[PDB]
Amino acid sequence: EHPEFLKAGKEPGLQIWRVEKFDLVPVPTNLYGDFFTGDAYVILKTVQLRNGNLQYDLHYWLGNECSQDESGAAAIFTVQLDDYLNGRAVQHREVQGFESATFLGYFKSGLKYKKGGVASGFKHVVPNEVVVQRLFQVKRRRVVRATEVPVSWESFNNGDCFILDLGNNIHQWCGSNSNRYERLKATQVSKGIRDNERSGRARVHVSEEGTEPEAMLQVLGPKPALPAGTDAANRKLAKLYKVSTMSVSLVADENPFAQGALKSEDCFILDHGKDGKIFVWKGKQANTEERKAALKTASDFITKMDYPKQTQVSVLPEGGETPLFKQFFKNWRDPDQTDGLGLSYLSSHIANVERVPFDAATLHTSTAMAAQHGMDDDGTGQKQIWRIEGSNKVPVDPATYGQFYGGDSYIILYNYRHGGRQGQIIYNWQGAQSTQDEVAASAILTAQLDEELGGTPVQSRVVQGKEPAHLMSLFGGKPMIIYKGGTSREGGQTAPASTRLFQVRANSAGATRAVEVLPKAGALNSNDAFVLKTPSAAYLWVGTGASEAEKTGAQELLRVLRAQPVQVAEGSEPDGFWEALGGKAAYRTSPRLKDKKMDAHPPRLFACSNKIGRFVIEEVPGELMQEDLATDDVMLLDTWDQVFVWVGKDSQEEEKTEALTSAKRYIETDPANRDRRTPITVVKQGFEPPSFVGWFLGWDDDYWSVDPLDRAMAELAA
Amino acid sequence: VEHPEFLKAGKEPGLQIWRVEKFDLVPVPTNLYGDFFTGDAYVILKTVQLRNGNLQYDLHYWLGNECSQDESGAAAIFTVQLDDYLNGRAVQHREVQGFESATFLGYFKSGLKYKKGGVASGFKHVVPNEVVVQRLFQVKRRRVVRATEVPVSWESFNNGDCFILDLGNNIHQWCGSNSNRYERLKATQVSKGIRDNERSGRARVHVSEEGTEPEAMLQVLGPKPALPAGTDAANRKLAKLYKVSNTMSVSLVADENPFAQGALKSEDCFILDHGKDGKIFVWKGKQANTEERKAALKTASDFITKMDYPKQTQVSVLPEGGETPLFKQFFKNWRDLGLSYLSSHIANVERVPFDAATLHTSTAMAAQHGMDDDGTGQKQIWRIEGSNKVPVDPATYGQFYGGDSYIILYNYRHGGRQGQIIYNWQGAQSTQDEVAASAILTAQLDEELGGTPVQSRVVQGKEPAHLMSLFGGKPMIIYKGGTSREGGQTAPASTRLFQVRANSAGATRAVEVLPKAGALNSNDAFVLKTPSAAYLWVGTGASEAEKTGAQELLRVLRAQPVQVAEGSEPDGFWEALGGKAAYRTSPRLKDKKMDAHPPRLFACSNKIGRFVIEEVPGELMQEDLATDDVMLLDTWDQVFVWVGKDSQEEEKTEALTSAKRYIETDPANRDRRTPITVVKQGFEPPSFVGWFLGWDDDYWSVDPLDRAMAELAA
């Protein structure tokens, strides 16, 4: 029990200790983000779960020129502090330059890798005035890092940004070939020095090649000629091993894994090394020695498989698993939480998000509600529906609006209104039994209609059976009914199947959807109402979980089906029902996430590029901020229910046309084995729908009216 | 038809005011209702329409301080005789200047004006127009302001009150330097009342305070000199009941309340003595001699002389069968569409039956049923172990063991607003260290959540309606003892009896009770589990929801039921209770609950170290929620504590205690376990706001006094 242990993790916040001489010494709070390259640190992030318990993320950070003793000393402190916190903390091994996204999210003024350490006699605490003559190099995109560099022109290159810190004057230098997002972020390194390190009393001078002030030319000399500046299919696969010098044995050859494969007596390693991270899962009932040696366990597994030493390592206690970990498993369920608030773990970057329940009356006032439910509006706007025959849009009979045949593909042009600026959504619905010359036609025609309308409408491709929530809400109160095949083109109408089964599901908004499924018992579920119609009789089955909205939709389907139903509760019904299904087997009844879906699958922001033919994606750590949407990039906003494609105005055109495909490749490569039919929603810069903007607390509508870099330089210049 | 004015009296719902001039009744002009000459006496007839369609009469007569005994006696004579013209169905009130009843004050809360003069000095209400005016009013008090005419001089002024110097076409309101800013707010509709009613709109209102008096003011009053300074609760518990004979003598019948309703026989007249609280009631039996019934007012006067109560004591005379709710609450379990009496300040309230579908659209429905929402929002339940919140097993959500205390954090949505409720449930067998821990932990989490959540402390057995509705359709199950702690599990009782009661919303609650026949009730379903078998009893009154809840309780108890209607039951059912005795068969108030116990709003303070409460008369209005006060809203089923933003910290910390002490002192002998619900200004729940017709959500966005002064400054 260290004295620093007693101050650790008492209240939500961030705490940083430096390991100095086998002791924990606090880093001054205003310097959080500065890390000496020669040192090791311990970092405790305390989040307040909505259930009332506190959640602990324990990181230790190893600089590149770290000594072996203090590298080991940090590990000892994390192991011993996890114990002071009764083994409920999630532990992280972080090394300089390769830190986890979680760790990086704590500091979005960037981090600074300072030269020196305890061995060379350097501290964070500094006298009131101290002569400064440092230089920093700033590279990367999602989370910027400034590395202390030798004060010389040999450190410079055309393409990066540089901060030469002269004390009361901070000189930010932007290379000639630095594109303009990098200068913007390099400026919050400049201000961090001014505000945090100099208590405000300093000025920031920005310059580029050929406009260096004499103060800069005095220290570095005459400027010479500077030189130039200076992969996704890996993430799909992962294996699960069991831990017992200790050895390992494989348990699952490929993901998704069975949640039952983790037993509480042992420790497991989930190997995701080709993507740069390995997990260690501490069973509730493992040897005290195995749980205390989990970090050395991970170290030995990294040597054994010849993974890079910089590989990220996370250790998770049973019952405190992270959402990224649980997504490796098929249908993870925490036996606790369908009741209570939240789940075992609350991702730090959405811990501030206040949860808004859906209320149709006031939805038009809350972008938060629109995003948190995927509902741009209440669904009552004007709309036109086309069925695609051959290569043409053919208008659908307005009386049949809401009915969709699986042998067709459709286009919906919808006019939404929410808040202060109106917009349009183009839905491309592709039935599972539409001929793929027509599906492909529906795609092209969708893009054609987007550019006819000036290129501003949202485009969202949906596959039959995985319709987004806002799409079901477009038909007054009537349910969205989706037949498994056939066509509504005037030509060949067909004779309905002998015995058909429909599944009637509802969304946060009370709207309903009726999907045909093969008439078999293994396709039922207690969360929904169903409708089975035979030549004999007409059933309406109702699940234990099905509520009042599920049945209102279900009959109105009977009303369209030319029927009177037999109302039938779950488990207690005539034995004529299950003969109509050709027997009986198991069907899954575990309830749906609903309000906790955001807890189990927080939205994540990625950048993506198709350069040199390799797809590659970069997660953007920390809170979702509009500032991270680089106007020359195509971004991915994954909200689990759908993947948003944000295309910047100034992005390359080959990336713009491939926006749909890029998202499809993100889904195909997700280690969670995502549903291939997951809707993809392309979104243009400056015309983002509410269901996208709402995820960015502090979104400003005029953000791009003034160029972002030019505005930032106004704050420093005046 | 004693009088020509009698024929116009009480024909239509409204208010009627006559001044007693020369042993005659002459109408006060309607636009001047509220002005009263100190030298006169008035008769005031309030006519409200009962919910069945009949008219009910409240007859007041008002005695000014400078009233003559003859014209005061004439008012009393008229009150007795107009009660007679209305066939003796009226409740009569004796009101004296400055000490009027809350009922009387509710008629005028643009304030009252106590004018100088009277009939004897030849002054009338009707006056020629554009007439010279030079009057001065001192405006003190708080709940219902009173502006008394004072001499036009600086010697009438003081540091702390408000004053209106009425100059005719110019009305000057002066606010003393140390006048708190709610009283200035109140003086402001004293000022406009003169402007709108007395000056036909054509007049201007100039507000000023110490050191900014206009020259018009300094011309009339002179140079302003140095002004001087400005200028309980346990009484209401006890009351005694006497019987009246004839010269009058009295004899005691009930030493302390609650009284037996049967103690009043229809042959005699009774006096309920509550003089230490300032009121006495006299009760006229249906079949007493007219001679005693016509002298009820003189009887009350002489009884007040005998006990040396102050002359200003309020007097109400009640006819049998027409008693007021405040009167009936002195008796244990009073039994008579609507009821005998409808309190005036809720006669306009339209009653909303509960419909879950549109509850989110009607705050009125939320208040009238104690349901902030349908109960389906997200919630977290904690059990208190030692000094910690421990989350409950989600499988047992809805079950509560009486040997523990719990905290429930509930997220409600209603209309377009969000809110939170923290329920503190304290089991009857929880140890007092754990009870107290749950209390402290409750307050701790309220401040963790920014101080905005509603806090509601609940005692086992008196659960509010909205708490029972939180578990889908499953009933809130309440065991008599034991704990759900992962540590010591316990062995359930040999034979257990549950009482299954339902709410306005169909939600149910299953409360364990002693296995005795005298603990049954015809309105509810019951569940008896013995070692042998499990009965499910059903009452004459028990409905669909009562056994649906009762059934699923059997599902939790792992037992199969034998359905048993009341009066038609096996011997094993009555063996399992150890015999047979009488129990409760009187049906519940339900929709008439608001009629018998209308909501009432009080202000309370702990200043001087004594407790004090002041009732706020009239219609419940947001304006009466003084931002520097702690208010109590008693809805009988629950007591709301409304905490003003700008109240002292000693009062905020004692908000829970203040409500407990209000309950302890109620003469009705309220259930000590009555739920208390603390509520913060600007974060009021729908079940509170719904009682306030005209509630504005942005009312405090602009300061109330600043907004009021803009209306007069126009």
UniProtKB/Swiss-Prot annotation, chain B:
Residues 194-231 are annotated as: Disordered. Residues 194-209 have a biased composition (Basic and acidic residues). One of its GO terms (cellular component) is lamellipodium. GO terms for biological process: actin filament capping; actin filament depolymerization; actin filament organization; actin filament polymerization; actin filament severing; actin polymerization or depolymerization; amyloid fibril formation; barbed-end actin filament capping. Phagocytic cells, platelets, fibroblasts, nonmuscle cells, smooth and skeletal muscle cells. One of its GO terms (molecular function) is phosphatidylinositol-4,5-bisphosphate binding. Ca(2+) 3 binds at residues 160-161, 183. Coiled coil: none annotated. Ca(2+) 1 binds at residues 39-40, 71, 119. Phosphorylation on Tyr-33, Tyr-341, Tyr-397, Tyr-535 and Tyr-583 in vitro is induced in presence of phospholipids. The modification Phosphotyrosine is found at residues 33, 341, 397, 535, 583. The modification Phosphothreonine is found at residue 674. Keywords: Acetylation, Actin capping, Actin-binding, Amyloid, Amyloidosis, Calcium, Cilium biogenesis/degradation, Corneal dystrophy, Cytoplasm, Cytoskeleton, Disease variant, Disulfide bond, Metal-binding, Phosphoprotein, Repeat, Secreted, Signal. The modification N6-acetyllysine is found at residue 516. Ca(2+) 8 binds at residues 628-629, 651. A 1,2-diacyl-sn-glycero-3-phospho-(1D-myo-inositol-4,5-bisphosphate) binds at residues 109-116, 135-143. Residues 1-123 are annotated as: Actin-severing. Residues 70-73 are annotated as: Actin-actin interfilament contact point. Comprises six structurally related gelsolin-like (G1-G6) domains, that, in a calcium-free environment, are packed together to form a compact globular structure in which the putative actin-binding sequences are not sufficiently exposed to enable binding to occur. Binding calcium may release the connections that join the N- and C-terminal halves of gelsolin, enabling each half to bind actin relatively independently. G1 and G4 bind two Ca(2+) in a type I and in a type II manner. G2, G3, G5 and G6 bind only one Ca(2+) in a type II manner. Belongs to the villin/gelsolin family. It is linked to Amyloidosis, hereditary systemic 4, Finnish type: A form of hereditary systemic amyloidosis, a disorder characterized by amyloid deposition in multiple tissues resulting in a wide clinical spectrum. AMYLD4 is due to gelsolin amyloid deposition and is typically characterized by cranial neuropathy and lattice corneal dystrophy. Most patients have modest involvement of internal organs, but severe systemic disease can develop in some individuals causing peripheral polyneuropathy, amyloid cardiomyopathy, and nephrotic syndrome leading to renal failure. Binds to actin and to fibronectin. Identified in a complex composed of ACTA1, COBL, GSN and TMSB4X. Interacts with the inactive form of EIF2AK2/PKR. Interacts with FLII. Calcium-regulated, actin-modulating protein that binds to the plus (or barbed) ends of actin monomers or filaments, preventing monomer exchange (end-blocking or capping). It can promote the assembly of monomers into filaments (nucleation) as well as sever filaments already formed. Plays a role in ciliogenesis. This is Gelsolin. It comes from Homo sapiens. The lineage of its organism: Eukaryota, Metazoa, Chordata, Craniata, Vertebrata.
